[PDB]
Amino acid sequence: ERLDIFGVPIDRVTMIQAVDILNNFLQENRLHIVATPNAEIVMMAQKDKEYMEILNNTDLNVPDGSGIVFASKVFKKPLPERVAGFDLMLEFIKGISSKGVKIYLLGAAAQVAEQARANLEKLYPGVKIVGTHHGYFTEEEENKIIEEINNKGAEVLFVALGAPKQEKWIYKNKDKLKVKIAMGVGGSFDVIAGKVK
Numbered sequence: 677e678r679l680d681i682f683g684v685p686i687d688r689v690t691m692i693q694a695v696d697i698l699n700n701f702l703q704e705n706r707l708h709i710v711a712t713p714n715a716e717i718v719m720m721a722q723k724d725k726e727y728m729e730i731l732n733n734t735d736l737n738v739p740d741g742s743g744i745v746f747a748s749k750v751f752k753k754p755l756p757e758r759v760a761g762f763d764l765m766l767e768f769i770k771g772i773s774s775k776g777v778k779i780y781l782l783g784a785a786a787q788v789a790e791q792a793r794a795n796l797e798k799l800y801p802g803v804k805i806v807g808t809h810h811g812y813f814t815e816e817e818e819n820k821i822i823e824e825i826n827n828k829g830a831e832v833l834f835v836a837l838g839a840p841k842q843e844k845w846i847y848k849n850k851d852k853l854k855v856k857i858a859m860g861v862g863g864s865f866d867v868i869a870g871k872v873k
């Protein structure tokens with residue numbers, strides 16, 4: 677059940693339902709692209725044709741913030757509840773930390789993804805974070821990074837490059853990445869590492 681909020685399909689999910697969908701994606705041997713659009717992303721999509729095509733080709737668009745939920749009141753079946761994409765990422769990580777699911781952290785300025793990894797290992801002990809890399813890489817570094825992601829057998833890839841850059845990166849490389857879930861997480865690395873509020 678999806679809502680066409682100005683071209684952008686938003687899945688009518690609650691935080692519990694969104695986490696169950698991601699856990700089911702881990703059982704399917706194929707790449708699933710996950711996005712968490714907020715009202716600002718919907719406005720960006722209006723001016724960016726490429727981003728709009730990407731948002732209509734993702735496996736799951738979880739709504740982000742109160743804004744998009746307020747705007748959905750125009751529909752016959754509005755969005756069930758306010759869902760924060762940051763909270764979705766931590767709830768998802770909380771569940772798979774005990775199951776030993778391999779995670780890769782790509783994105784943020786130098787050392788932020790290593791600091792986030794350290795903090796995640798303190799919050800959810802047993803989390804398997806197989807690798808990290810900053811999001812200011814060159815094409816030559818990108819080649820080594822995709823090989824590291826695939827060869828380390830990572831199942832979940834969090835891309836912290838900001839929107840639309842993270843979606844555009846995941847989509848450009850969908851045929852190269854051998855992970856089960858690739859999700860754009862924006863500035864969540866700065867928040868987890870403690871760089872930002």
Ligand SMILES: CC(=O)N[C@H]1[C@@H](OP(=O)(O)OP(=O)(O)OC[C@H]2O[C@@H](n3ccc(=O)[nH]c3=O)[C@H](O)[C@@H]2O)O[C@H](CO)[C@@H](O)[C@@H]1O
Pocket residue numbers: 714716717783784785810811812836837838839840841861862863864865866
């Ligand atoms: C409100 C919203 O949802 N969208 C904002 C944002 O999303 P978003 O808030 O995700 O964008 P930011 O650029 O502020 O977040 C980028 C994050 O990725 C990292 N980083 C950034 C760039 C890069 O090349 N590599 C990298 O690793 C940063 O260190 C940070 O952790 O996108 C645009 C920035 O272009 C803004 O105009 C939008 O208002």
